[PDB]
Antibody, heavy 219, light 217 residues
Framework: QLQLQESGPGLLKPSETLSLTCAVS?????????WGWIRQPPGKGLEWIGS????????DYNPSLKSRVTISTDTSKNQLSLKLSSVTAADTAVYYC??????????????????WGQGALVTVSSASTKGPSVFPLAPGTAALGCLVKDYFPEPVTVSWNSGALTSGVHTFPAVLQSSGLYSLSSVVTVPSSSLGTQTYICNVNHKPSNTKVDKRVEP | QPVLTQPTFLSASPGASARLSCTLS?????????IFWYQQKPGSPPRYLLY?????????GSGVPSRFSGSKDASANAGLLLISGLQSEDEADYYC?????????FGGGTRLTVLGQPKAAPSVTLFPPSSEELQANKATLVCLISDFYPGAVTVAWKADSSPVKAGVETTTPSKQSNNKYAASSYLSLTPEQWKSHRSYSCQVTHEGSTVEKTVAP
């Protein structure tokens, strides 16, 4: 019944320290085997960063990252932390927190990542953050949408009507423009008979710039 | 070379069994390692599936159907993930892992394709520039392309009847949750360019046939 609530995505300049947290809800950060962090560069595979063990407070880090990594827990906040110093572009990745469970095999005890946070994309770049410009795309099913133009870095999330509307929603993967900025669109298919009486608002969140826009889309 | 090797891609037929391999390099005996398997679908975090060390020592991840099982192939020095009654929904990336010399070592992952999906033409929706964008002295045509299979399209744009190549940005196709594909294309124009033509068209070609949508000022 435990769940991991991971902190959000964002941009870092090279040489800065990455800092992520994971709040455990639905029970205690203590009493189990341990916790860990795993990352995944966009379009690439998984890489374990390190683990921390609850009984001892001992840590086991990926040896290629050891000099830069700190994993810790704070029992009073029920919180797991990762710090990674002196970042470069090679550290751009989705970072996941996870609960570690041990398992008794034959000659040894081993372990696995049983429960995962949702991931946070951390981008390391010399480019500045830029929040999106959001434009309505005006509309028996009718299509209407929102254009989310010229932002950096990923990600952007889009919901409709504060998440109440999910049926018929299609948010498209972003295009990376030659400028280096991203644009995406989200479209929702709705009954055409509802257009005169139902309000439609796209909620566009760009966490790396702490900016959210709610755009009313009308006929 | 890396301690664990997985094939980049694997295709398998629906209803049949998929056999995903995790080959351990020579000098490392597969008999000596517990093999852990994780499944990852687009957008979502990896999901623990199961581990296998021997017939007497193995365990299934919580909520993972018995269709998924583990084994080892001693002669190939490989751990195996076997998926029976293969469903379309099983299309995902699969990662193996072992603990070796105190580290968690991941394989590079295998992307599993489930064969037999029918060909499907793209649905295309084209939006003209919004009044708000035009007021900001910009104009973007938005061409949204969905539910096509296999995952390849080309996009061309026309101003009236003339090809427009400048200002076009088009994504690579990406797998949807329903295992079909989506892509989008954006044409950047000046408001003056937008107003000076009778129409613009987005033309999406897939398997030799084309769907065109038109919008007008």
């Amino acid at each position: 019944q435990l769940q991991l609530q991971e902190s959000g995505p964002g941009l870092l300049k090279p040489s800065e320290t990455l800092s992520l947290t994971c709040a455990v809800s639905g029970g205690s950060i203590s009493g189990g085997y341990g916790w860990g962090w795993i990352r995944q560069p966009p379009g690439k595979g998984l890489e374990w960063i390190g683990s921390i063990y609850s009984s001892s407070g001992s840590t086991d880090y990926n040896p290629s990252l050891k000099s830069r990594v700190t994993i810790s827990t704070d029992t009073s906040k029920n919180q797991l932390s990762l710090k990674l110093s002196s970042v470069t572009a090679a550290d751009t990745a989705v970072y996941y927190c996870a609960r570690v469970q041990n398992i008794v095999v034959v000659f040894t005890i081993k372990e696995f990542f049983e429960l995962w946070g949702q991931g946070a994309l951390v981008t390391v770049s010399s480019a500045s953050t830029k929040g999106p410009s959001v434009f309505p795309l005006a509309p028996g099913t009718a299509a209407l949408g929102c254009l989310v133009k010229d932002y950096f870095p990923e990600p952007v999330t889009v919901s409709w009507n504060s998440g109440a509307l999910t049926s018929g929603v299609h948010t498209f993967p972003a295009v990376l423009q030659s400028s280096g900025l991203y644009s995406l669109s989200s479209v929702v298919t709705v009954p055409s008979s509802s257009l005169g009486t139902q309000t439609y608002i796209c909620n566009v969140n760009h966490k790396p710039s702490n900016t959210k826009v709610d755009k009313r889309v009308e006929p | 070379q890396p301690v664990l090797t997985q094939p980049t891609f694997l295709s398998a037929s629906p209803g049949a069994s998929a056999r995903l391999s995790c080959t351990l390099s020579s000098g490392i005996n597969v008999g000596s390692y517990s093999i852990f398997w994780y499944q990852q679908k687009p957008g979502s975090p990896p999901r623990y599936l199961l581990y296998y060390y021997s017939d007497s020592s193995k365990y299934q991840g919580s909520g993972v159907p018995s269709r998924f099982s583990g084994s080892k192939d001693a002669s190939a020095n490989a751990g195996l993930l076997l998926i029976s009654g293969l469903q379309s929904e099983d299309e995902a990336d699969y990662y193996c892992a072992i603990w070796h010399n105190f580290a968690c070592v991941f394989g590079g992952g295998t992307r599993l394709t489930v064969l037999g999906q029918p060909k499907a033409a793209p649905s295309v929706t084209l939006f003209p520039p919004s009044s708000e964008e035009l007021q900001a002295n910009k104009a973007t045509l938005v061409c949204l392309i969905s539910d096509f299979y296999p995952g390849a399209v080309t996009v061309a744009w026309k101003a009236d009847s003339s090809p427009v190549k400048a200002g076009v940005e088009t994504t690579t196709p990406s797998k949807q949750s329903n295992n079909k594909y989506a892509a989008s294309s954006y044409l950047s124009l000046t408001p003056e360019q937008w107003k000076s033509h009778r129409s613009y068209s987005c033309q999406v070609t897939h398997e030799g046939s084309t769907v065109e949508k038109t919008v007008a000022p």
